[PDB]
């Protein structure tokens, strides 16, 4: 039970990293901005700064307080 859970969660983490890696390879190599004018894809690239900044905030908001509560208890 321990080996099977550990095995498939590690496979899951590798597959999840690879999906994003090949999405990056998609944008570099296969993405054409003139066939995708004002798509969902192009509008993602139009507000990428908002997504990255909000992801930076949520990670800090979780990190500061989860590490803070753990260190408090310690």
């Amino acid at each position: 039970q321990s080996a099977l859970y550990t095995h498939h969660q590690y496979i899951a983490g590798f597959l999840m990293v690879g999906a994003f890696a090949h999405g990056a390879i998609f944008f570099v190599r296969d993405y054409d901005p003139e066939q995708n004018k004002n798509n969902v894809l192009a509008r993602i690239l139009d507000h990428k700064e908002a997504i990255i900044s909000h992801l930076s905030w949520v990670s800090l908001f979780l990190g500061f307080h989860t590490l803070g509560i753990y260190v408090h208890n310690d």
Binding site: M16, F20, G23, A24, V28, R29, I52, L62, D74
Partner: protein
């Protein structure tokens, strides 16, 4: 203890996602290298000018997120395994009391459960857990060689 570890898992998922998303969305260009798409997916850097551009490629964000993926699956499997071995003894209260601070994870999970593993061979003999005892040290060696 389950509350605190679920929030740690959430932080790890968001941070791994941040590096991977930032890598995908800045892959075509940024302010340091606006023409990053002409160079490909995996290139070393753009040189020491403009302040320094080490790890600027989208491949390098895959590289940086791989450490955070390993950290995330580490926190998940450490949680699953400690909660399950304490339930399997009948001593779920050991997880309940020690999981709320980090020294409980250090002494009651890693240090306490290390002892059958690191005694797989010793100056008094060996048993069939010797192979895992060797693989354990083998794992410590490769990891450090990566550094």
């Amino acid at each position: 203890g389950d509350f605190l570890i679920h929030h740690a898992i959430a932080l790890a998922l968001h941070t791994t996602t941040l590096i991977l998303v930032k890598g995908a969305l800045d892959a075509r260009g940024s302010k340091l290298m606006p023409d990053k798409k002409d160079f490909g997916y995996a290139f070393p850097c753009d040189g020491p000018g403009r302040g320094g551009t080490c790890d600027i490629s989208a491949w390098d964000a895959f590289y940086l997120s791989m450490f955070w993926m390993l950290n995330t699956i580490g926190w998940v499997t450490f949680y699953w395994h400690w909660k399950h071995i304490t339930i399997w003894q009948g001593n779920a209260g050991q997880f309940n009391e020690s999981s709320t601070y980090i020294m409980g994870w250090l002494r009651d999970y890693l240090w306490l459960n290390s002892s059958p593993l690191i005694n797989g061979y010793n100056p008094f003999g060996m048993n069939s857990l010797s192979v895992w005892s060797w693989m354990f040290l083998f794992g410590h060696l490769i990891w450090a060689t990566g550094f």
